Amino acid sequence: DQQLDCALDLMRRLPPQQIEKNLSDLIDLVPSLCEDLLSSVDQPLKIARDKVVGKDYLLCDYNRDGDSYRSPWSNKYDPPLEDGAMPSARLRKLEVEANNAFDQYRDLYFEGGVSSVYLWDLDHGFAGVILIKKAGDGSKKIKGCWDSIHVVEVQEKSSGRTAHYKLTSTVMLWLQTNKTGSGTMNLGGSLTRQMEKDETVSDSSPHIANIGRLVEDMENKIRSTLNEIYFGKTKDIVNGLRSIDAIPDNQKYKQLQRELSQVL
Amino acid sequence: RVSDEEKVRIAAKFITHAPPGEFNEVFNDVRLLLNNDNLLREGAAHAFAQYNMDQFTPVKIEGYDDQVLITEHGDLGNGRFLDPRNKISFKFDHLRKEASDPQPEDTESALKQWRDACDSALRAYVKDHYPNGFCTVYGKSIDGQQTIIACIESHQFQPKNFWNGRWRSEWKFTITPPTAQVAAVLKIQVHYYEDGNVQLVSHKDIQDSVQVSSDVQTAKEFIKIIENAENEYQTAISENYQTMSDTTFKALRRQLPVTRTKIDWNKILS
Amino acid sequence: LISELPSEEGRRLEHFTKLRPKRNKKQQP
């Protein structure tokens, strides 16, 4: 478990542009860590096609079993599977609802893209994953992509009427161009955040409603920090590496003030 | 269930790809994971050196100001690198970034004079445009042709703030009077990692031709070409950042739905 | 020969994805 910490530390340093190929290698390098890495390292979401209902679905570790994936639409594995991990018929019903709910959510904030929601049974409650993938248009000169991975944990209290929610959300944001002006330019990666809240479970405010509000808040708050880090911070860093206008004797000199100061 | 010869290849790949100013951290990660200091020292010795030459690592030499860049153009075999400004040789430890053994060295006076006039004018340019910049200018023969190689490095390391950044320029001037062939590569890399992993990788190839004269007069013109090319590159970067921000990002996820208000979840559920 | 190199980030980098709910597969990948 000090091994895993290293792998994850490495994954936060190797270029996110090669997340998929790097994870492949990292596992080969330390095969015991596989199961763990696969569940704790986020990868750009892939789209598969449920041929039965004719609709796309998203793929992560939480709907994988073996080398097969469970479509939230037909509730079946592809390629077909002997005995795959399924949700209890009680939960499946909530899953199918959560998918419809987050489908609208998707439309409301993304005006397109794909969403998929997978629920699974825990001990004193349940857990869910909410996935959203939206791609920018090939009409404009810049390729863009947005992957959302929201993992929620629900711990129901013995009463009902109140429950505790743990949310871990990752957004992966990918931007890229071959505009001859700047050669190639790839700005990519992700941010992760945590919310933890207790809330009323009524009929007017059920689980999906509670999870939804949490997701919405986090996604709005991330969308913000993303914009600020991607187009604010990383750019400022660039501008702090080189200056177009010839450096003014003021900063040149303020810099000597501080350079000299750092004497062991 | 994968060969030990392969495992080290992966480990080597990982090390070469360490973000700027995070070599140690990546190395420690890779070491602990491979779990075989014997494989590391053999099949990865090549990687440590390659990374430093690849990254244009600046290094201080004792009693000298200022620093010199570790490139493939200063590589002399052994484990020794050339400082063309001071005309000295020195030993380098690729693992601990240590420059030992200052040793007077003899330069092929074939280009010496052209090199000095560049190294001189580029020093002034670097000083003017790169807050924490270092540069090293080489003069050596490639395929019987006199080449001048100007290398620029600039970095800002702030591990405490979970971000690092580096600029690398490599300008090659093959000099065949009365003309010179310009060929360059400009690289940027930025890593942000507070509660995530976000990176900018960008490079630009530059290719050009110019008419030459006296060494001093065309050293000055070389620098102007460099200045112009790099400004255009940094501008293009900033312009693309703009477009990315207020066009393609806005087009990915809205800030609020078209109803200008947060989602009514009751409506969603019935 | 050899060494364990000195980082200066002070704080270990913390991995939020560890504390996410686990899910039991009926077979491994």
XYZ file of C-alpha atoms in Angstrom:
563
model
C 0.000 0.000 0.000
C 3.050 2.211 -0.095
C 3.419 0.778 -3.599
C 0.010 2.078 -4.687
C 0.803 5.542 -3.319
C 3.864 5.672 -5.589
C 1.941 4.546 -8.655
C -0.713 7.188 -8.034
C 1.975 9.794 -7.394
C 3.549 8.838 -10.662
C 0.250 9.108 -12.501
C -0.075 12.690 -11.302
C 3.245 13.527 -12.893
C 3.328 11.660 -16.195
C 1.667 13.615 -19.032
C -2.114 13.083 -18.912
C -2.080 13.025 -22.691
C -0.789 9.449 -22.389
C -2.912 8.350 -19.413
C -4.222 5.218 -21.115
C -0.894 3.910 -22.414
C 0.894 4.754 -19.164
C -1.582 2.864 -16.990
C -1.193 -0.098 -19.272
C 2.552 -0.016 -18.607
C 2.329 0.831 -14.900
C 0.267 -2.352 -14.384
C 2.772 -4.452 -16.343
C 5.476 -2.981 -14.131
C 3.670 -3.907 -10.884
C 1.002 -6.542 -11.669
C -0.045 -7.055 -8.038
C -1.330 -3.461 -8.040
C -3.570 -4.044 -11.075
C -6.981 -4.456 -9.417
C -6.296 -1.419 -7.269
C -4.911 0.849 -10.021
C -7.784 0.030 -12.366
C -10.237 1.304 -9.747
C -8.310 4.362 -8.559
C -6.731 5.790 -11.760
C -9.096 7.786 -13.958
C -8.958 7.326 -17.735
C -10.558 9.253 -20.627
C -14.002 7.733 -21.014
C -14.681 5.408 -23.983
C -18.023 5.064 -25.736
C -19.506 1.653 -26.471
C -22.681 0.834 -28.383
C -25.562 -1.169 -26.947
C -26.777 -2.884 -30.105
C -30.041 -4.077 -28.437
C -31.641 -0.687 -27.689
C -29.482 1.221 -30.221
C -27.902 3.686 -27.747
C -24.355 4.623 -26.664
C -23.004 3.996 -23.155
C -19.837 4.999 -21.312
C -17.107 2.689 -19.979
C -15.199 2.802 -16.713
C -14.016 0.238 -14.163
C -17.367 0.287 -12.311
C -19.323 -1.396 -15.104
C -16.537 -3.738 -16.104
C -16.434 -7.367 -15.122
C -13.541 -9.372 -16.529
C -13.218 -7.939 -20.031
C -16.908 -7.205 -20.453
C -19.006 -4.115 -19.771
C -22.566 -3.663 -18.553
C -24.875 -1.447 -20.605
C -27.192 0.608 -18.378
C -29.802 0.415 -21.108
C -30.254 -3.331 -21.552
C -28.621 -4.342 -18.222
C -26.509 -6.939 -19.992
C -22.803 -7.593 -20.468
C -20.805 -7.198 -23.683
C -19.171 -9.366 -24.755
C -21.751 -11.683 -23.159
C -20.798 -12.996 -19.741
C -21.473 -16.148 -17.739
C -21.835 -14.717 -14.200
C -21.283 -10.968 -14.071
C -21.704 -8.608 -11.127
C -25.239 -7.224 -11.323
C -27.325 -4.899 -9.223
C -30.160 -6.187 -6.990
C -33.553 -5.776 -8.716
C -34.382 -3.059 -6.106
C -31.246 -1.084 -7.077
C -31.549 -1.683 -10.833
C -34.865 0.166 -10.629
C -33.175 3.125 -8.954
C -30.337 2.897 -11.473
C -32.685 3.051 -14.444
C -34.199 6.187 -12.792
C -30.870 7.786 -12.023
C -29.950 7.309 -15.670
C -33.088 9.083 -16.829
C -32.524 11.856 -14.315
C -28.886 12.458 -15.256
C -29.758 12.197 -18.911
C -31.823 15.342 -18.517
C -29.133 16.912 -16.369
C -26.726 16.243 -19.220
C -28.993 17.874 -21.774
C -29.504 20.809 -19.465
C -25.827 21.655 -18.965
C -24.101 20.100 -21.988
C -26.729 20.283 -24.765
C -25.505 16.964 -26.147
C -22.866 14.365 -25.315
C -23.404 11.016 -23.614
C -24.242 10.102 -20.017
C -24.308 6.803 -18.104
C -24.978 6.020 -14.452
C -24.012 2.798 -12.695
C -25.118 1.848 -9.183
C -23.845 -0.979 -7.010
C -24.719 -2.477 -3.621
C -22.631 -1.638 -0.567
C -22.973 -2.640 3.110
C -25.058 0.017 4.911
C -26.242 1.780 1.769
C -25.090 1.948 -1.869
C -22.725 3.640 -4.283
C -22.968 5.176 -7.736
C -20.918 6.469 -10.643
C -22.180 9.231 -12.940
C -20.365 9.638 -16.251
C -20.681 12.392 -18.842
C -18.691 12.818 -22.067
C -19.083 15.866 -24.319
C -16.997 16.656 -27.394
C -16.532 20.006 -29.146
C -17.189 20.491 -32.864
C -14.850 19.818 -35.833
C -16.311 23.048 -37.383
C -13.954 25.206 -35.157
C -10.139 24.960 -35.291
C -9.612 23.491 -31.821
C -10.424 19.921 -30.744
C -11.969 19.761 -27.266
C -13.336 17.185 -24.877
C -14.904 16.986 -21.428
C -15.098 13.833 -19.284
C -17.017 13.861 -15.973
C -16.560 11.142 -13.373
C -18.684 11.497 -10.244
C -18.443 8.723 -7.657
C -20.957 8.978 -4.837
C -21.300 6.907 -1.678
C -24.606 6.747 0.216
C -24.638 5.656 3.855
C -28.241 5.320 4.998
C -28.980 5.785 8.696
C -31.236 3.154 10.411
C -34.273 5.502 10.543
C -34.499 6.428 6.859
C -35.339 10.166 6.367
C -31.621 11.090 6.694
C -28.447 9.885 4.911
C -24.754 10.791 4.499
C -23.282 11.408 1.057
C -19.602 11.206 0.019
C -18.817 12.611 -3.416
C -15.527 12.294 -5.262
C -15.612 14.063 -8.617
C -13.054 14.226 -11.403
C -13.357 16.288 -14.555
C -10.966 15.656 -17.410
C -10.540 18.527 -19.867
C -8.769 18.187 -23.185
C -7.872 20.938 -25.637
C -5.651 20.713 -28.688
C -4.715 22.385 -32.053
C -2.376 22.200 -35.017
C -2.856 25.889 -35.980
C 0.414 26.567 -37.851
C 1.002 29.682 -35.681
C 1.854 27.579 -32.612
C 2.880 24.186 -34.063
C 1.079 21.625 -31.942
C -0.465 22.690 -28.664
C -2.027 20.220 -26.258
C -3.477 21.386 -22.976
C -4.976 18.458 -21.100
C -5.518 16.714 -17.789
C -7.960 16.771 -14.880
C -8.908 18.035 -11.432
C -10.533 16.166 -8.521
C -12.597 17.431 -5.524
C -14.552 16.104 -2.476
C -17.891 17.076 -0.902
C -19.357 15.365 2.138
C -22.884 16.160 3.316
C -25.853 14.876 5.318
C -29.357 15.495 3.896
C -33.070 14.870 4.396
C -34.490 11.881 2.518
C -38.184 12.615 1.976
C -40.609 11.859 -0.841
C -40.328 15.381 -2.156
C -36.531 15.065 -1.826
C -35.434 11.439 -2.549
C -31.952 10.021 -3.196
C -31.544 10.893 -6.875
C -32.555 14.469 -6.040
C -29.965 14.637 -3.260
C -27.184 13.148 -5.368
C -28.126 15.405 -8.280
C -27.851 18.652 -6.283
C -24.469 17.538 -5.021
C -23.231 16.710 -8.504
C -24.570 19.981 -9.953
C -22.810 22.017 -7.255
C -19.512 20.224 -7.682
C -19.627 20.379 -11.457
C -20.404 24.094 -11.365
C -17.625 24.670 -8.885
C -15.151 22.616 -10.937
C -16.106 24.190 -14.269
C -15.019 27.386 -12.552
C -11.632 26.273 -11.144
C -10.938 24.500 -14.450
C -11.368 27.727 -16.407
C -9.222 29.573 -13.888
C -6.408 26.987 -13.853
C -6.381 26.033 -17.533
C -6.728 29.481 -19.105
C -5.544 31.540 -16.128
C -2.734 29.814 -14.175
C -1.002 27.621 -16.800
C -0.931 30.620 -19.151
C 0.576 32.902 -16.522
C 3.226 30.291 -15.953
C 3.979 30.385 -19.687
C 4.174 34.163 -19.579
C 6.541 33.915 -16.589
C 8.969 31.834 -18.653
C 9.422 34.380 -21.414
C 8.454 38.018 -22.029
C 7.770 39.536 -25.470
C 8.475 43.120 -24.369
C 12.070 43.518 -23.246
C 12.322 43.060 -19.481
C 12.080 46.399 -17.656
C 14.910 47.210 -15.329
C 12.435 47.210 -12.431
C 11.718 43.472 -12.336
C 15.274 42.678 -13.411
C 16.293 44.565 -10.231
C 13.490 43.369 -7.928
C 14.702 39.930 -9.015
C 18.311 40.606 -7.969
C 16.944 41.834 -4.642
C 15.436 38.432 -3.999
C 18.130 36.286 -5.674
C 20.819 37.715 -3.405
C 18.554 37.280 -0.370
C 18.519 33.466 -0.885
C 22.071 32.974 0.476
C 21.885 29.408 1.945
C 4.338 -12.244 -16.191
C 6.366 -9.837 -18.400
C 10.159 -10.146 -19.049
C 12.647 -8.286 -16.823
C 14.196 -6.787 -19.932
C 10.792 -5.279 -20.784
C 10.131 -4.075 -17.222
C 13.269 -1.938 -17.263
C 12.331 -0.563 -20.709
C 9.055 0.704 -19.215
C 10.870 2.052 -16.191
C 13.253 3.889 -18.534
C 10.358 5.281 -20.588
C 8.722 6.591 -17.418
C 11.910 8.345 -16.259
C 12.530 10.082 -19.595
C 8.987 11.465 -19.428
C 9.270 13.095 -15.992
C 7.785 16.593 -16.011
C 10.268 19.466 -15.619
C 11.662 19.771 -12.067
C 10.070 16.561 -10.883
C 12.742 14.106 -11.969
C 13.506 12.962 -8.453
C 9.868 12.361 -7.577
C 9.319 10.311 -10.766
C 12.586 8.420 -10.278
C 11.741 7.497 -6.685
C 8.312 6.327 -7.837
C 9.820 4.230 -10.647
C 12.497 2.723 -8.427
C 10.178 1.591 -5.683
C 7.832 0.062 -8.266
C 10.421 -1.876 -10.261
C 12.013 -3.116 -7.027
C 15.334 -4.076 -8.548
C 18.151 -1.536 -8.103
C 20.283 -3.912 -10.223
C 18.069 -3.656 -13.295
C 17.707 0.072 -12.767
C 21.458 0.855 -12.804
C 22.026 -1.092 -16.038
C 19.006 -0.743 -18.346
C 18.175 2.772 -17.183
C 21.618 4.464 -16.996
C 20.893 5.548 -20.586
C 17.656 7.217 -19.438
C 19.130 9.513 -16.741
C 21.580 11.075 -19.189
C 19.080 11.298 -22.023
C 16.619 13.178 -19.812
C 19.148 15.834 -18.817
C 20.328 16.434 -22.383
C 16.713 16.362 -23.530
C 15.677 18.924 -20.924
C 18.634 21.320 -21.396
C 19.371 21.090 -17.651
C 21.245 24.161 -16.437
C 24.110 23.446 -14.035
C 26.366 25.641 -11.916
C 30.116 25.053 -12.176
C 32.112 26.119 -9.114
C 33.805 29.537 -9.377
C 32.110 30.316 -12.709
C 29.256 32.625 -13.632
C 27.155 31.702 -15.179
C 25.621 28.264 -15.668
C 25.911 25.976 -18.674
C 23.374 23.668 -20.335
C 23.626 19.905 -20.532
C 22.763 19.135 -24.155
C 23.724 16.388 -26.566
C 26.015 18.975 -28.232
C 28.262 19.216 -25.173
C 28.449 15.434 -24.693
C 32.036 14.193 -24.971
C 31.485 10.544 -23.987
C 33.073 9.538 -20.624
C 30.595 11.488 -18.509
C 32.040 14.850 -19.470
C 30.430 17.948 -20.952
C 31.780 21.062 -22.698
C 31.341 24.660 -21.599
C 32.138 26.531 -24.811
C 31.975 29.970 -23.144
C 34.705 29.212 -20.615
C 36.424 26.687 -22.920
C 36.437 24.065 -20.148
C 35.487 20.417 -19.728
C 33.698 19.045 -16.652
C 32.290 15.837 -15.190
C 28.578 15.416 -14.557
C 26.524 13.115 -12.339
C 23.185 12.647 -14.090
C 21.411 11.444 -10.955
C 22.379 14.228 -8.593
C 22.882 17.096 -11.100
C 26.466 17.659 -9.892
C 29.240 19.312 -11.862
C 32.686 18.275 -10.663
C 36.229 18.585 -12.097
C 36.740 21.906 -13.967
C 39.343 21.142 -16.649
C 40.796 23.661 -19.167
C 39.847 22.563 -22.714
C 41.000 23.416 -26.253
C 38.356 24.633 -28.780
C 38.576 24.023 -32.574
C 39.432 27.643 -33.452
C 37.690 27.016 -36.807
C 34.488 28.727 -35.629
C 35.672 30.169 -32.302
C 35.258 33.733 -33.538
C 31.731 33.299 -34.967
C 30.681 31.415 -31.827
C 31.851 34.199 -29.489
C 29.926 36.854 -31.398
C 26.746 34.760 -31.111
C 27.242 33.591 -27.513
C 27.760 37.275 -26.826
C 24.655 38.706 -28.540
C 22.428 35.839 -27.373
C 23.530 36.417 -23.753
C 22.071 39.934 -24.068
C 18.858 38.687 -25.661
C 18.320 35.974 -23.045
C 18.908 38.591 -20.313
C 16.209 40.778 -21.920
C 13.415 38.203 -22.420
C 13.878 35.250 -20.062
C 13.501 36.099 -16.370
C 15.454 33.053 -15.215
C 17.162 32.226 -18.495
C 20.365 30.419 -19.366
C 21.942 29.827 -22.765
C 24.838 27.954 -24.303
C 26.115 28.414 -27.889
C 28.080 25.666 -29.650
C 30.198 25.817 -32.804
C 30.930 22.440 -34.428
C 31.185 20.772 -37.857
C 28.275 18.606 -39.082
C 28.787 16.758 -42.405
C 31.707 19.012 -43.320
C 29.480 22.056 -42.710
C 30.082 24.693 -40.070
C 27.097 24.783 -37.717
C 26.272 27.165 -34.860
C 23.847 25.778 -32.270
C 22.200 28.222 -29.863
C 20.338 26.683 -26.919
C 18.081 28.620 -24.541
C 16.523 27.311 -21.310
C 14.197 29.034 -18.874
C 12.296 27.470 -15.944
C 10.121 28.274 -12.905
C 9.896 25.546 -10.265
C 7.360 25.837 -7.482
C 6.878 22.368 -6.047
C 5.318 23.871 -2.925
C 2.541 25.205 -5.151
C 2.237 22.049 -7.229
C 3.303 23.611 -10.542
C 6.455 23.664 -12.679
C 7.258 25.114 -16.114
C 10.072 25.162 -18.679
C 10.948 26.754 -22.031
C 13.564 25.246 -24.366
C 14.839 26.727 -27.613
C 17.293 25.046 -29.975
C 18.450 27.089 -32.949
C 20.735 25.554 -35.599
C 22.539 27.789 -38.090
C 24.444 25.799 -40.759
C 26.768 28.402 -42.266
C 27.705 28.131 -45.914
C 28.716 31.668 -46.983
C 27.198 33.699 -48.513
C 24.099 31.948 -46.975
C 23.040 30.345 -43.699
C 20.289 27.741 -43.142
C 18.184 28.304 -40.046
C 16.414 25.395 -38.334
C 14.839 25.607 -34.909
C 12.590 23.836 -32.432
C 10.760 25.738 -29.705
C 9.318 23.798 -26.755
C 7.026 24.758 -23.861
C 5.931 22.529 -20.959
C 3.814 23.337 -17.928
C 2.636 20.968 -15.200
C -0.020 21.802 -12.632
C -0.864 19.221 -10.018
C -2.784 20.583 -7.025
C -5.648 18.121 -6.659
C -5.115 17.017 -10.269
C -2.762 16.567 -13.217
C -2.905 19.189 -15.920
C -0.179 19.699 -18.496
C 0.623 21.899 -21.459
C 2.913 20.465 -24.102
C 3.735 22.502 -27.178
C 6.495 22.724 -29.732
C 7.091 24.616 -32.964
C 9.465 23.870 -35.797
C 11.049 26.854 -37.527
C 12.937 26.804 -40.784
C 14.463 29.784 -42.621
C 17.367 30.992 -44.814
C 19.473 34.168 -44.661
C 22.286 36.023 -46.417
C 25.504 36.463 -44.400
C 28.355 38.932 -44.047
C 30.929 39.516 -41.274
C 30.632 37.417 -38.112
C 29.616 40.334 -35.838
C 27.077 41.727 -38.350
C 25.233 38.442 -38.832
C 25.370 37.342 -35.223
C 23.200 40.419 -34.671
C 20.863 39.406 -37.489
C 20.600 35.815 -36.161
C 19.396 37.141 -32.822
C 16.763 39.297 -34.580
C 15.440 36.192 -36.364
C 15.323 34.363 -33.029
C 13.559 37.288 -31.360
C 10.935 37.551 -34.059
C 10.262 33.837 -34.308
C 9.912 33.370 -30.560
C 7.649 36.398 -30.093
C 5.330 35.105 -32.786
C 5.315 31.736 -31.069
C 4.498 33.161 -27.622
C 1.833 35.372 -29.199
C 0.294 32.446 -31.031
C 0.220 30.578 -27.706
C -1.534 33.476 -25.924
C -3.976 33.942 -28.796
C -4.807 30.219 -28.779
C -5.343 30.343 -25.019
C -7.811 33.130 -25.653
C -9.727 31.169 -28.297
C -9.703 28.044 -26.141
C -11.098 29.997 -23.228
C -13.892 32.104 -24.661
C -14.889 29.793 -27.564
C -14.260 26.041 -27.305
C -14.490 25.800 -23.503
C -17.833 27.661 -23.439
C -18.991 25.165 -26.050
C -18.258 22.124 -23.897
C -20.315 22.715 -20.792
C -22.612 25.665 -20.234
C -22.230 27.679 -17.055
C -25.943 27.491 -16.326
C -28.707 25.905 -18.422
C -30.530 27.930 -21.076
C -33.060 28.870 -18.386
C -30.387 31.050 -16.745
C -31.109 29.211 -13.448
C -30.052 26.044 -11.537
C -31.865 22.761 -12.225
C -35.334 22.101 -10.784
C -34.965 18.451 -9.777
C -38.687 17.900 -9.153
C -39.383 18.558 -12.818
C -36.601 16.140 -13.736
C -38.169 13.372 -11.670
C -41.708 13.656 -13.106
C 25.981 4.125 -5.892
C 22.919 4.324 -5.661
C 20.732 7.003 -3.954
C 17.197 8.001 -2.877
C 16.761 11.473 -4.401
C 15.640 14.595 -2.464
C 12.221 16.052 -3.296
C 11.261 19.450 -1.903
C 7.476 19.516 -2.182
C 7.268 19.054 1.566
C 3.829 17.467 1.639
C 3.151 14.132 0.003
C 0.719 14.430 -2.826
C -2.654 13.141 -1.619
C -4.727 10.793 -3.775
C -8.463 11.428 -3.418
C -9.423 8.414 -5.533
C -8.258 5.963 -2.850
C -11.152 6.808 -0.531
C -13.817 6.092 -3.190
C -16.254 3.193 -2.673
C -14.858 -0.191 -3.799
C -16.931 -2.564 -5.948
C -16.608 -6.365 -5.985
C -16.225 -7.922 -9.450
C -17.213 -11.554 -10.005
C -13.980 -11.976 -11.953
C -10.678 -10.027 -12.135
C -9.033 -8.165 -15.081
